[PDB]
Symmetry: C2
Subunit: 213 residues, 2 copies
């Protein structure tokens, strides 16, 4: 390391938690896009949300949901040919898992692609509350979570990624060798810490939230 790690001071009034795509389609073993490492992040996210709500830190869930008729999928459908049949609004598996069931004051923001920011309600929700700091958890680490992180920092948000509350998936060998979830995770967290914002643990962010409140 030749430059320091970044740490963002938490002002609860100007902070939100973003729970990325904790939907049945990614979290249930029978889900069409099941990411097995999600099992290990449900508990830390539950603790995080309990602390956030106690400190009046806004909780926002992202859901990847499309209409189902193909009117809102172009590149997404080229890359995932079955997208209209698995992420359709009518599909039961687009719902957030019961273990993380949104509460009445929480905000739900739906999105057509990976980014939580691009062409979504999220920037309005955050700026209306004068939020400038976001804590990101959920799945998939390097895809929807990282795109939300990259898009957030480009809008000047102070982004905190939770090392133990973002879940990555294995990839098949497409010409460049096998890629494990552990390798994805290692590379993603390192990249975030060097390029995009802060990486810390769920426990430390909870402590920081409790101390500021």
């Amino acid at each position: 390391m030749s430059k320091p790690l970044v740490r963002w001071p938490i002002n609860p009034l100007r902070t939100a938690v973003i729970v990325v795509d904790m939907q049945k389609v990614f979290c249930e073993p029978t889900g069409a896009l099941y990411v097995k490492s999600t099992a290990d992040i449900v508990q830390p996210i539950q603790k995080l949300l309990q602390a956030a709500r106690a400190a009046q830190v806004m909780v926002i869930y992202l859901r990847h949901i499309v209409r189902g008729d193909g009117s809102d999928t172009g590149r997404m459908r080229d890359l995932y040919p079955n997208v209209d049949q698995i992420l359709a609004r009518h599909d039961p598996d687009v719902e957030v898992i019961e273990a993380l069931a949104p509460q009445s004051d929480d905000v739900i923001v739906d999105k057509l692609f990976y980014s939580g920011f691009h062409n979504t309600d999220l920037d309005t929700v955050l700026r209306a509350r004068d939020v400038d700091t976001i804590i990101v958890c959920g799945t998939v680490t390097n895809v929807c979570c990282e795109t939300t992180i990259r898009d957030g920092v480009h809008r000047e948000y102070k982004v905190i990624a939770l090392s133990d509350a973002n879940a990555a998936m294995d990839y098949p060998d497409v010409g460049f060798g096998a890629v494990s979830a552990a390798d994805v995770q290692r590379i993603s967290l390192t990249t975030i810490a060097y390029e995009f914002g802060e990486v810390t643990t769920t426990a430390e962010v909870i402590r920081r939230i409790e101390s500021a409140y």
Copy 2:
């Protein structure tokens, strides 16, 4: 692999090449942000640009350049504390390397952060020409190149990343283990091929350009 690799058919009239940040600051050994693997991508990019110009495929260079006074760096300055002194417009090393010197009909688009699209002229330049397909090369693979790729696909562009013409850098161990350029590259190209668009070689894209013209 359970879903197919994506290949985009090249229409030269609706295609552009994007050369990401081939600036002295990244490409010269004395540069403040030197990425040694750039040495290996200069030749393929030269071949690519020669073929593109011959087929009237628009060539666009991105440069990461800031004013120098700190007025246009917030998060970028938190992450790279010296940014105003190394990427300032007056700094000689922000210029594109002579080996890839832009020609009179080429387009140069400047940017304040990593993304070639966010808050830049790029979308105007591409859509004005009715371009919907972009070929991405340059540095750094997982940072400016990948952010440009992610941002491009979210705008519905058909994106082709060149496996042998994007250069990655090593990272220090920040808590998750050492990360080599080779590992960054492996993970990035695999992610692009699964999530964001096409990965192919410079030679194959040149052939595809020549055959369509």
